[PDB]
Design a protein around this ligand. Sequence first.
Ligand SMILES: NC(=O)C1=CN([C@@H]2O[C@H](COP(=O)(O)OP(=O)(O)OC[C@H]3O[C@@H](n4cnc5c(N)ncnc54)[C@H](O)[C@@H]3O)[C@@H](O)[C@H]2O)CC=C1
Ligand SMILES: NC(=O)C1=CN([C@@H]2O[C@H](COP(=O)(O)OP(=O)(O)OC[C@H]3O[C@@H](n4cnc5c(N)ncnc54)[C@H](O)[C@@H]3O)[C@@H](O)[C@H]2O)CC=C1
Ligand SMILES: NC(=O)c1ccc[n+]([C@@H]2O[C@H](COP(=O)([O-])OP(=O)(O)OC[C@H]3O[C@@H](n4cnc5c(N)ncnc54)[C@H](O)[C@@H]3O)[C@@H](O)[C@H]2O)c1
Ligand SMILES: NC(=O)c1ccc[n+]([C@@H]2O[C@H](COP(=O)([O-])OP(=O)(O)OC[C@H]3O[C@@H](n4cnc5c(N)ncnc54)[C@H](O)[C@@H]3O)[C@@H](O)[C@H]2O)c1
Ligand SMILES: [Ca+2]
Ligand SMILES: [Ca+2]
Ligand SMILES: [Ca+2]
Ligand SMILES: [Ca+2]
Ligand SMILES: [Ca+2]
Lengths: 314, 314, 314, 314
Amino acid sequence: MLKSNKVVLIGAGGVGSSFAYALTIDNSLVHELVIIDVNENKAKGEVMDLNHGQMFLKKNINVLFGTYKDCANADIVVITAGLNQKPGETRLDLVDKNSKIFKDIITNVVSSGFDGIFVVASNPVDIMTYVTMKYSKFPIHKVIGTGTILDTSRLRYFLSDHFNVNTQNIHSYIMGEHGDSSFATWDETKIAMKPLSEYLAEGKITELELDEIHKKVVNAAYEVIKLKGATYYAIGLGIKNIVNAIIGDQNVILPISSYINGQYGGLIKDIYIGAPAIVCKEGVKEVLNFKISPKELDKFNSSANQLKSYIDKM
Amino acid sequence: MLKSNKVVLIGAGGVGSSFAYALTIDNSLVHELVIIDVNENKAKGEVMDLNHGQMFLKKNINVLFGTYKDCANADIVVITAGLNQKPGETRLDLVDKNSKIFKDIITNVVSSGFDGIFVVASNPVDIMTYVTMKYSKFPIHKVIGTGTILDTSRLRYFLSDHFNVNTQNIHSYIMGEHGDSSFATWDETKIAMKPLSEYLAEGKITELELDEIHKKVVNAAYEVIKLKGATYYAIGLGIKNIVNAIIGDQNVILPISSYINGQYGGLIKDIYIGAPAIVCKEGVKEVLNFKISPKELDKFNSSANQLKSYIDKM
Amino acid sequence: MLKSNKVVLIGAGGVGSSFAYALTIDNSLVHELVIIDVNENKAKGEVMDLNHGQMFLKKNINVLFGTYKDCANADIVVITAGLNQKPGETRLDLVDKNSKIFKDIITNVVSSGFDGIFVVASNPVDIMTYVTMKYSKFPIHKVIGTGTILDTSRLRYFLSDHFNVNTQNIHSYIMGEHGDSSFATWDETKIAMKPLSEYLAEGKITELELDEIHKKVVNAAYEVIKLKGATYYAIGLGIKNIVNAIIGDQNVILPISSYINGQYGGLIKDIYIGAPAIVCKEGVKEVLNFKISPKELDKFNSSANQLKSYIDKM
Amino acid sequence: MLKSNKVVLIGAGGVGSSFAYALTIDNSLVHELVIIDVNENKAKGEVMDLNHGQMFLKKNINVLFGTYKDCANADIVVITAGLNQKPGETRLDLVDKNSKIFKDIITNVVSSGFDGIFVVASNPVDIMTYVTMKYSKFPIHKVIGTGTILDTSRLRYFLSDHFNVNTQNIHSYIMGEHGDSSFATWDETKIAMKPLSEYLAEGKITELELDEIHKKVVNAAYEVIKLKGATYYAIGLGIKNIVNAIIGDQNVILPISSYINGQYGGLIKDIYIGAPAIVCKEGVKEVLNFKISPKELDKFNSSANQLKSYIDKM
Ligand SMILES: NC(=O)C1=CN([C@@H]2O[C@H](COP(=O)(O)OP(=O)(O)OC[C@H]3O[C@@H](n4cnc5c(N)ncnc54)[C@H](O)[C@@H]3O)[C@@H](O)[C@H]2O)CC=C1
Ligand SMILES: NC(=O)C1=CN([C@@H]2O[C@H](COP(=O)(O)OP(=O)(O)OC[C@H]3O[C@@H](n4cnc5c(N)ncnc54)[C@H](O)[C@@H]3O)[C@@H](O)[C@H]2O)CC=C1
Ligand SMILES: NC(=O)c1ccc[n+]([C@@H]2O[C@H](COP(=O)([O-])OP(=O)(O)OC[C@H]3O[C@@H](n4cnc5c(N)ncnc54)[C@H](O)[C@@H]3O)[C@@H](O)[C@H]2O)c1
Ligand SMILES: NC(=O)c1ccc[n+]([C@@H]2O[C@H](COP(=O)([O-])OP(=O)(O)OC[C@H]3O[C@@H](n4cnc5c(N)ncnc54)[C@H](O)[C@@H]3O)[C@@H](O)[C@H]2O)c1
Ligand SMILES: [Ca+2]
Ligand SMILES: [Ca+2]
Ligand SMILES: [Ca+2]
Ligand SMILES: [Ca+2]
Ligand SMILES: [Ca+2]
């Protein structure tokens, strides 16, 4: 029989609100969208503002103010709650703050009876995916993090503007930690079928500009925060696409926070890191295994070791 | 010869940014979006955040930070700049400040050689539309204000929730000044082909409940501002829809800020007010005229007299 | 847990194939589409042609050759099987022949354990909807026919071309039999908020031009059959919208083949006929009832009495 | 100022009508669609059938029956007119017949004053693209053929079913003549960024399976023709995607009938053949030049030799 697909959103700030907006505009069958925030006034205001535009939507959608009661029968739970760049300094203190919040949130969600899929966006996304997995006891393939999807989006925009080519034809990935230790898969990048190495040999692009594009990908968050306070639109679209791919059972490969256990180096094991995986109706279907050049394998290993280091502390 | 369609957005606040985001998601052929703001940092940050999500869009779109000089060959100019009102404030009050702002903006735009269509969202929207028309000396059919489209969307959502029927089947308008003096076309309202009067007879809705819905429509702005600082999602969708109807040459009737000079009894003439008009590629094709209940006509004339009072102060 | 929505198409002719194509293009999430035809080569070929274009679709979709075995776990069964009307042949001339086909189809379907929703398009659509309900022994809310949705689309196109106004703003229905006994709700018709009587008064349209539009609606099928043998595009879109409205649980009012037993004066009861009804996740939520002019009521009763003259012979 | 975009379709058969249907459903702002056919009755019937479903479309669009005089101000001309291969008809016979038909069509069109873009689909599509360019005298960049876009779509569907992965991650081309002398770019294929080589090593696929996939791609046309008479859905979607890429100025790379004179070793020059090119508002912006394995270059040169000989005959 036909069912009502339910998505609960925990965290009604810039990122969560942007995701909800984009989802109401472009919906792949999300019958009910439930919004939860510790600041209940903000959640109620967002629910009202999103409902007031139903007349302009292609489809109608039930946007509801919610409590954790609502997670019992939910099909997806999207977490965007946290302290976006808090004041005390230190990203280890950030991890502590946000994992403290996640303890509470996850306990409430699991005590509700929820048995769907987690989609995690709160920073540091990889560590918070790990924390969600452990605090919840869910299977690893029911816990997803956005990982390097936003970094990959930025990378592909930079390459599209460089070559003046639709992002549709830009086949490159950012992998590793969603942060400063990320790396681009330069050696495996293609523009449509044309390898990047041919573009280098023909002089359209140089290794210098590749270094600069990567530095740009890494500095984009800081640039945008300086310019406008926060970043939410691109990540909102990424979250929306993950959700639509899940509910669409599209078997699509995405650069998400993936749990690796031998893939790539046979060295990196037992953590969530930015990597390509198949997404479908049940969550993660497969963590893809492919060879990366030695340079990029060393970068991957260093990134995973940085992640292990930050986990160890707490 | 195929053309590149250009929209210049002036005012990169909540409303303008929401409209730009929605437009990038649901794009009816806008090839170039130029974002202007007296706060250059905010415009640049919004441009970067909007471009970093191209990968997730149906179609790539060129988004630019620009300056008034870009209005020269622009096809549409959307103005969302000004003061946005806060607790204990109204819309009919930010009139002299916002009119000065519009003087400056319009002078710059027209000086650049622009000759396209103005789409005005800033408040008080009817008054600012009249101001745009007279400062620009453009044809009146090239000046569109958003009018009562947001009020109408809210009304239709409330009626949809009451009857649990898709908004598509809700045929009702809010008319008059976008604000406190507005009214609903209760006596002309239908659910599909079923008159609202029949629902009243059947006891499925009450007169008191209609008055409740109208008070909710009028107080929605104050509610949502109290709850989350400002409204911007619904109005962003409405602006997106107006822009797409223009570029698409869709000949669609919308309740916008329309110039009346004889319609609805001709008691009040030569002002912009919330009323239905046909929108097309060239701007406003017609401002329609239909008979409304006598009580509703009295309400309409009261609203128009308030507006004309504020305008005659000049 | 999330679900795979399944639609089984029975009848891979022009109408069925148009519906399948349109659905693959504009897919409110059918994860699986099965195509059944007594001419199995035709079904195989259609399946292949539909799958060969997956690269150009927004979303992938599994299109399968199947048999009645596939109806067991089907969420929706669309029936487009039957006999086309030949030149000089009315829809009702098919009653006998097609009735026999349905007896077989409905038999097999019911034997597989299907307990979803029927969407009936084969002609004469109202009588075939009644026959489906009687053979299947299903609840009346689980059997839907397209009724006068196609005639209504035609009426709205003709009015949109007369007034040069988007079909969005054309609020008029064709009701009664999907055939030569249909009528238009001229007295209840409105263009946005503006009644049709006001256009008549202003001379923007004449009574005789309304009669001409009705005659054109009635004779559209015969004209198109003469010109190219059969119609399938418009009805393809109509069925597609019905299906997406069901799966989307959109609670949308549509002029479908609705079961009446007391509505519209109760002078004829216990038939299916073209009338407005709410569509949602599990079929028909409610068959509406509104008051229509006495002449229109005489026409409605004539049509209903014709349809019952046929149903009584059964 | 804003322009109306005009597409003129010559040939209202299966392919042209499917393209028109798909375009009305998924419309990147074609304001006017004009359908021309020597068989006036068929064109009129299709115009009526497409118009009768406007109420179900996301956007309204003026679909009109017309004559060659309408090409004067057309922005795109899509030619689907001509015969398809029959049993015992070689590419040579089809070339003869369809080149005569194109003589007629191109003469009429150019006499009308048309100065837009040609999109060619009649078979053999590479030769007919060359012939359109030669007869019209238009620039090379203003004459586009569908090339191997359909064979590429079929290839990617087959790989998507085999690897059970979204077509959106299947990076592989069919190149050469749109026919039996086509070949797959096996040695440059990647799923996401896992080379097909790696899939072969692990036994996930075999060489015989690749040969059978290429055989299926080459035989699909005959199979579907035997099964249901003709193919037209997939190529309809392909033509629609090309038209929307054009009007959208999307700068997208597609495997179309591209004019080569140096690329791929430059052994054969001055022909249209299935190859990747950037599509934009002005037509073909650039014909790309990635380089391929020795096997595949031998195949490509054989195919180009075929085409060039058939051309030199004339
Ligand atoms: N139905 C409607 O039409 C509605 C109208 N609204 C009004 O829209 C306007 C914008 O609202 P918000 O975005 O929420 O407020 P906001 O402060 O977040 O944004 C206003 C923007 O305008 C900028 N600005 C000011 N002057 C100029 C100038 N001369 N040139 C360029 N930019 C300038 C300013 O820097 C700011 O970024 C306000 O007047 C609102 O009252 C808001 C809600 C709905
Ligand atoms: N509701 C509406 O508005 C309209 C109703 N239409 C009717 O829809 C029906 C189909 O029309 P067309 O597609 O043009 O005709 P068609 O000949 O092209 O296709 C009908 C299909 O039904 C097949 N069929 C017959 N019996 C069975 C069976 N037991 N199981 C499976 N398949 C079977 C048959 O092989 C054929 O392929 C006709 O009855 C039309 O009169 C057509 C147009 C619009
Ligand atoms: N994964 C990515 O690519 C990426 C992109 C941008 C930033 N982020 C991060 O994700 C989060 C997004 O934050 P933001 O930009 O929306 O800032 P924000 O402050 O506007 O939103 C954070 C929300 O979390 C709420 N919250 C706090 N504790 C809560 C609790 N126990 N339960 C429910 N809600 C609670 C807060 O009330 C607030 O509304 C941050 O951690 C941010 O650093 C993710
Ligand atoms: N990937 C591809 O390129 C591909 C795929 C399928 C078939 N085709 C080809 O497209 C063309 C149409 O295929 P079809 O299946 O629709 O066959 P069809 O017979 O159904 O349609 C051809 C149309 O062209 C019309 N026509 C003939 N001569 C004309 C003239 N001088 N002026 C105007 N119109 C004329 C005919 O009236 C007919 O309607 C064929 O050449 C076919 O081989 C393209
Ligand atoms: Ca550039
Ligand atoms: Ca309710
Ligand atoms: Ca007209
Ligand atoms: Ca006339
Ligand atoms: Ca498979």
